[PDB]
Amino acid sequence: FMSQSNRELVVDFLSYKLSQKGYSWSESEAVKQALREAGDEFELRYRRAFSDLTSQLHITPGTAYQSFEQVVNELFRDGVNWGRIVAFFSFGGALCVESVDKEMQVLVSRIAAWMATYLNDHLEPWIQENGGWDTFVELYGN
Numbered sequence: 687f688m689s690q691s692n693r694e695l696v697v698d699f700l701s702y703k704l705s706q707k708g709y710s711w712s713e714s715e716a717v718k719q720a721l722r723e724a725g726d727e728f729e730l731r732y733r734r735a736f737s738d739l740t741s742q743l744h745i746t747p748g749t750a751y752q753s754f755e756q757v758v759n760e761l762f763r764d765g766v767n768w769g770r771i772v773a774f775f776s777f778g779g780a781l782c783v784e785s786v787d788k789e790m791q792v793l794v795s796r797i798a799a800w801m802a803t804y805l806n807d808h809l810e811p812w813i814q815e816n817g818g819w820d821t822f823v824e825l826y827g828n
């Protein structure tokens with residue numbers, strides 16, 4: 687029952703990041719805007735780490751899930767917090783841009799699904815217990 691809303695948040699963020707990197711293909715608005723702003727701030731703060739990610743990934747359709755699962759499990763190893771959720775969205779965004787750059791566009795819809803499933807199954811309980819997305823908007827939005 688949460689599947690569609692979590693999918694909408696993931697697709698809004700990924701569409702935004704792909705557009706920001708030059709690819710125009712293929713309140714809920716307050717949450718989407720706060721996440722876009724948080725993702726931008728995160729990328730500007732950790733630009734070096736994105737460069738290290740884009741140079742060590744060697745993304746292929748066969749390894750993309752293994753890479754996704756490895757990084758996401760490491761990110762949340764010590765538990766969840768809002769900063770790690772922002773890193774999770776940012777990582778997904780970076781993986782999608784890298785997939786399109788390497789002519790592996792087929793991975794974009796796959797990564798969106800892996801992100802929505804992880805948000806649904808592992809992050810949603812923490813999100814609700816820590817004030818919901820309205821709390822996130824207060825801490826990261828405007």
Ligand SMILES: CN1CCN(CCCNC(=O)c2c(-c3ccccc3)c(-c3ccc(Cl)cc3)cn2CC[C@H](O)CO)CC1
Pocket residue numbers: 732735736739757760761773774776777778780
């Ligand atoms: C020696 N270590 C000292 C401390 N650091 C590791 C622990 C903190 N970093 C992470 O957990 C982390 C982040 C991340 C998380 C938040 C901020 C910055 C980086 C990302 C990440 C990469 C790309 C994008 Cl786009 C987004 C996130 C991946 N990881 C885990 C994979 C990494 O190889 C470590 O195991 C650096 C090396």
